[PDB]
C-alpha cells in the first residue's frame, strides 16, 4: 500500500529523470542532460518545490515534466498522507 | 498532537539547516553555508514554496534536502490541517 506509493513514486522519478535527459540532450544550452542532475530536477518537481536551478527548455522535455508532476505529485501526495497518519494514529 | 507536529517540524527545520550547512561547506561557490541562511532555505522547502535564492549544489546537500522535503512537507502538512480544523470547528 505505502511501499506501493514510495515505489510508484521512485519509478516516476527514475522514469522522468531518464526521459528528460533523453528529451533534453540535442538542444544547445540544455541544462537538464545528466540523470544525476535530471534526478534532483525530478524530485524538486514532484514535491512542487520549484527552486528553478533546472528545468526543460524543449517541448518533449516539458511534456515529460507534466507527467512527472501529474504522477509524481499524486504519488508523493500518497507518502505525505502515509507519514501524516503514522504520526496521528500513534500520538 | 499539534504541538507534536509543530515541534517535529521545528526539529526537521533545525535538523536540515544544521546538516545542509555541514553538507554544503567545502564546495567552492556554495551559497547554503550558514545556519541562519540554511534556516530560510529549510522553511522555504518544507512549505514547497521554492523561491530559489538558495539551494544545495552538492549531492549530500540534496540528500539532506529530500529528507527535509519528505519529513518537512508531511510535518508542515500536519500544522496546515491543524489550523484548518481550528477555523472550521469554531465558525
Amino acid at each position: 500500500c505505502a511501499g506501493a506509493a514510495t515505489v510508484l513514486l521512485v519509478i516516476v522519478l527514475l522514469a522522468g529523470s531518464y526521459l528528460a535527459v533523453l528529451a533534453e540532450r540535442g538542444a544547445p544550452g540544455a541544462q537538464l542532460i545528466t540523470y544525476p542532475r535530471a534526478l534532483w530536477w525530478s524530485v524538486v518537481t514532484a514535491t512542487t518545490v520549484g527552486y528553478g536551478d533546472l528545468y526543460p527548455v524543449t517541448l518533449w522535455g516539458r511534456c515529460v515534466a507534466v507527467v512527472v508532476m501529474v504522477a509524481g505529485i499524486t504519488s508523493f501526495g500518497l507518502v505525505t498522507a502515509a507519514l501524516a497518519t503514522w504520526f496521528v494514529g500513534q500520538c | 498532537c499539534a504541538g507534536a507536529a509543530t515541534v517535529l517540524l521545528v526539529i526537521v527545520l533545525l535538523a536540515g539547516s544544521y546538516l545542509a550547512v555541514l553538507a554544503e561547506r567545502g564546495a567552492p561557490g556554495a551559497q547554503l553555508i550558514t545556519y541562519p541562511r540554511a534556516l530560510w532555505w529549510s522553511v522555504v522547502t518544507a512549505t514547497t514554496v521554492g523561491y530559489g535564492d538558495l539551494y544545495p549544489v552538492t549531492l549530500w546537500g540534496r540528500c539532506v534536502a529530500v529528507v527535509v522535503m519528505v519529513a518537512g512537507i508531511t510535518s508542515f502538512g500536519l500544522v496546515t490541517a491543524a489550523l484548518a480544523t481550528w477555523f472550521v470547528g469554531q465558525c
Partner: antibody, heavy 116, light 107 residues
Amino acid sequence: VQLVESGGGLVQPGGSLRLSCAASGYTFTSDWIHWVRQAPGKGLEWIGEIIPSYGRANYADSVKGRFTISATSKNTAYLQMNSLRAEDTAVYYCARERGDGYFDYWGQGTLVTVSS
Amino acid sequence: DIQMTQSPSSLSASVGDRVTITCRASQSIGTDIHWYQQKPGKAPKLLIKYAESISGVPSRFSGSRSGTDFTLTISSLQPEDFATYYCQQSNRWPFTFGQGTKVEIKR
C-alpha cells in the same frame, strides 16, 4: 569492459564510410556511446551521442545532418559518414558515457583520410 | 556555445616540480568539468571527474577551484606525464573540450 572499433581508412571527397564500436563488456541498459574526432595535431571535437535503447542520436553543427549514428543485437553503434570534406581527415574514437557526462572508456579509434 | 579556455598550450617544467593547468569556462558550468590525459597516438584517459579522482589515477593528480577557473595540478611532474591534457564541460548541451595543454619534461 573495452570498445572495439572497425572500418575506416581512405575515401574520396563527397564519398562514404561506416565506422564500428562493438561493446565487449558489462554494458548497462542506459549508456550513450559518443563519437569524438581528432584532426592531425589538433584537439578533440565532440560530434555525436546515441542511446542504443530508444535509438535517439544527437550531432554537432560541425557534422550537422551530414552524418548518422546507428544503434543492441550486436551491442554496437555505428558512424555513417556521408558528404565527407577534407577537414573530416582525422582519427575517430567512440566512448561510453553513463549519463554522468564524462568518458570512462574509449575505443582504440581509427583513421579516416579524405583526399582525391 | 560553452568555451573551455585551457592555459597554457605548452609547458617545459623540470621533473618533480609543481605543474598546474588552468581551464576558464565562458560561463559558470557548476563543477561539471572533467580532465583527460591523452598520450601521443593513444586514446584520451580520464584523470578527474567533477574536479573527484578516478581509480588507478596517481596521487600526483588533483583538480580544484571554481567560479570559471578549473585547475588540474601535478604534485611532482613525472617522466610518464609527457602528454597532452584535456578539459571537458558537461553543464550545458552539448559537451565541449578545451584547446588542450601539452606537457614536455625538462632534464
